[PDB]
Scaffold this active site. Sequence first.
Site, PDB file in Angstrom:
ATOM      1  N   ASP A   1       0.768  -1.236   0.000  1.00 20.68           N
ATOM      2  CA  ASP A   1       0.000   0.000   0.000  1.00 20.68           C
ATOM      3  C   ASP A   1       0.807   1.298   0.000  1.00 20.68           C
ATOM      4  O   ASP A   1       1.374   1.672   1.025  1.00 20.68           O
ATOM      5  CB  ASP A   1      -0.903  -0.027   1.239  1.00 20.68           C
ATOM      6  CG  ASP A   1      -2.094   0.890   1.117  1.00 20.68           C
ATOM      7  OD1 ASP A   1      -1.930   2.032   0.619  1.00 20.68           O
ATOM      8  OD2 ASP A   1      -3.200   0.468   1.534  1.00 20.68           O
ATOM      9  N   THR A   2       0.839   2.000  -1.129  1.00 19.69           N
ATOM     10  CA  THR A   2       1.561   3.274  -1.193  1.00 19.69           C
ATOM     11  C   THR A   2       0.790   4.366  -0.460  1.00 19.69           C
ATOM     12  O   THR A   2       1.339   5.415  -0.134  1.00 19.69           O
ATOM     13  CB  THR A   2       1.795   3.735  -2.647  1.00 19.69           C
ATOM     14  OG1 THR A   2       0.678   3.362  -3.459  1.00 19.69           O
ATOM     15  CG2 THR A   2       3.054   3.120  -3.203  1.00 19.69           C
ATOM     16  N   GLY A   3      -0.486   4.120  -0.197  1.00 12.59           N
ATOM     17  CA  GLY A   3      -1.285   5.108   0.504  1.00 12.59           C
ATOM     18  C   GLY A   3      -0.901   5.238   1.964  1.00 12.59           C
ATOM     19  O   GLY A   3      -0.774   6.336   2.492  1.00 12.59           O
TER      20      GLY A   3
HETATM   21  C1  LIG Z   1      -4.123  13.072   8.250  1.00  9.00           C
HETATM   22  C2  LIG Z   1      -3.340  12.199   7.270  1.00  9.00           C
HETATM   23  N1  LIG Z   1      -2.720  11.058   7.599  1.00  9.00           N
HETATM   24  C3  LIG Z   1      -2.049  10.441   6.446  1.00  9.00           C
HETATM   25  C4  LIG Z   1      -1.270   9.158   6.518  1.00  9.00           C
HETATM   26  N2  LIG Z   1      -2.076   7.968   6.863  1.00  9.00           N
HETATM   27  C5  LIG Z   1      -3.216   8.002   7.788  1.00  9.00           C
HETATM   28  C6  LIG Z   1      -3.701   6.554   7.809  1.00  9.00           C
HETATM   29  N3  LIG Z   1      -2.771   5.872   6.894  1.00  9.00           N
HETATM   30  C7  LIG Z   1      -2.859   4.414   6.601  1.00  9.00           C
HETATM   31  C8  LIG Z   1      -4.144   4.129   5.753  1.00  9.00           C
HETATM   32  O1  LIG Z   1      -5.171   3.721   6.309  1.00  9.00           O
HETATM   33  N4  LIG Z   1      -4.030   4.384   4.402  1.00  9.00           N
HETATM   34  C9  LIG Z   1      -5.200   4.181   3.505  1.00  9.00           C
HETATM   35  C10 LIG Z   1      -5.380   5.497   2.700  1.00  9.00           C
HETATM   36  C11 LIG Z   1      -5.481   6.720   3.568  1.00  9.00           C
HETATM   37  C12 LIG Z   1      -4.533   7.758   3.428  1.00  9.00           C
HETATM   38  C13 LIG Z   1      -4.605   8.902   4.240  1.00  9.00           C
HETATM   39  C14 LIG Z   1      -5.617   9.037   5.209  1.00  9.00           C
HETATM   40  C15 LIG Z   1      -6.573   8.006   5.362  1.00  9.00           C
HETATM   41  C16 LIG Z   1      -6.503   6.855   4.545  1.00  9.00           C
HETATM   42  C17 LIG Z   1      -5.058   2.915   2.613  1.00  9.00           C
HETATM   43  O2  LIG Z   1      -3.956   3.060   1.747  1.00  9.00           O
HETATM   44  C18 LIG Z   1      -6.308   2.630   1.740  1.00  9.00           C
HETATM   45  N5  LIG Z   1      -7.385   2.121   2.604  1.00  9.00           N
HETATM   46  C19 LIG Z   1      -7.546   0.672   2.575  1.00  9.00           C
HETATM   47  C20 LIG Z   1      -6.693  -0.094   3.603  1.00  9.00           C
HETATM   48  C21 LIG Z   1      -7.033   0.361   5.028  1.00  9.00           C
HETATM   49  C22 LIG Z   1      -6.926  -1.597   3.477  1.00  9.00           C
HETATM   50  S1  LIG Z   1      -8.922   3.013   2.574  1.00  9.00           S
HETATM   51  O3  LIG Z   1      -8.573   4.401   2.552  1.00  9.00           O
HETATM   52  O4  LIG Z   1      -9.604   2.545   3.747  1.00  9.00           O
HETATM   53  C23 LIG Z   1      -9.987   2.673   1.195  1.00  9.00           C
HETATM   54  C24 LIG Z   1      -9.993   3.539   0.084  1.00  9.00           C
HETATM   55  C25 LIG Z   1     -10.859   3.282  -1.001  1.00  9.00           C
HETATM   56  C26 LIG Z   1     -11.725   2.157  -0.976  1.00  9.00           C
HETATM   57  C27 LIG Z   1     -12.614   1.931  -2.117  1.00  9.00           C
HETATM   58  N6  LIG Z   1     -13.367   0.828  -2.271  1.00  9.00           N
HETATM   59  O5  LIG Z   1     -14.179   0.716  -3.397  1.00  9.00           O
HETATM   60  C28 LIG Z   1     -11.715   1.288   0.145  1.00  9.00           C
HETATM   61  C29 LIG Z   1     -10.846   1.546   1.228  1.00  9.00           C
HETATM   62  C30 LIG Z   1      -2.865   3.602   7.940  1.00  9.00           C
HETATM   63  C31 LIG Z   1      -2.956   2.083   7.715  1.00  9.00           C
HETATM   64  C32 LIG Z   1      -1.602   3.896   8.775  1.00  9.00           C
HETATM   65  C33 LIG Z   1      -1.850   6.728   6.370  1.00  9.00           C
HETATM   66  O6  LIG Z   1      -0.952   6.448   5.580  1.00  9.00           O
HETATM   67  C34 LIG Z   1      -2.208  11.163   5.325  1.00  9.00           C
HETATM   68  S2  LIG Z   1      -3.160  12.609   5.549  1.00  9.00           S
END
Ligand SMILES: Cc1nc(CN2CCN([C@H](C(=O)N[C@@H](Cc3ccccc3)[C@H](O)CN(CC(C)C)S(=O)(=O)c3ccc(/C=N/O)cc3)C(C)C)C2=O)cs1
Lengths: 99, 99
Positions: free
Chosen positions: A25-27
Amino acid sequence: PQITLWQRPLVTIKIGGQLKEALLDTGADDTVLEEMSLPGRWKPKMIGGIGGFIKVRQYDQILIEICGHKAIGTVLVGPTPVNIIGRNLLTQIGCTLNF
Amino acid sequence: PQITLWQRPLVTIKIGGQLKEALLDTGADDTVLEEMSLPGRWKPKMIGGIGGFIKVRQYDQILIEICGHKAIGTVLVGPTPVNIIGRNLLTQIGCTLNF
Ligand SMILES: Cc1nc(CN2CCN([C@H](C(=O)N[C@@H](Cc3ccccc3)[C@H](O)CN(CC(C)C)S(=O)(=O)c3ccc(/C=N/O)cc3)C(C)C)C2=O)cs1
């Protein structure tokens, strides 16, 4: 290897001996893993996802094999859908985005 | 273009005449932005992940401008905490992980 996101970039990971299928996950900044036991002591960490902040445990300097590339580092554990390997471990195995 | 993962993979995007910043997220099933007005009809949907779920509006067949590359397909709208570009649109501009 080259992975194409037509599917979920799920890969096998080796942490502590047992193999686990995680999500590349790059997110995510960090690597959050599902409830499991790991060595040493842990610090408290708040992480807010798409649905809010939760309390996760943090074990630093943890040895995990990701798709064949030994890496050692912070591994967050807590209530997560799937296992998730974040940039902290992605930069280690030398992962990059290319288009 | 090789995008490293030493920092968050944030790239400019253009949608609905507007210009927004969004996190390239291979760990994001679908693209989902913060409240904004999109054309067409929509069906409500909910999304889980770290912290739980959130109700979002699902607009499909929506044009998007990532780094210049034009992509088309579903876009979620809701209380997401940051602009996310998912695999559904990433595949289009042809994006991949490499190591
Ligand atoms: C405040 C901020 N803080 C950060 C850093 N942060 C905060 C938290 N964080 C990570 C984190 O949860 N990253 C998220 C993206 C994200 C980025 C920034 C904020 C919130 C969410 C995942 O890469 C994608 N998720 C799926 C995964 C959970 C299986 S989804 O969003 O639930 C998802 C999306 C679309 C769909 C679509 N369906 O159809 C389903 C699920 C944690 C694990 C640490 C991170 O890097 C950036 S800004």
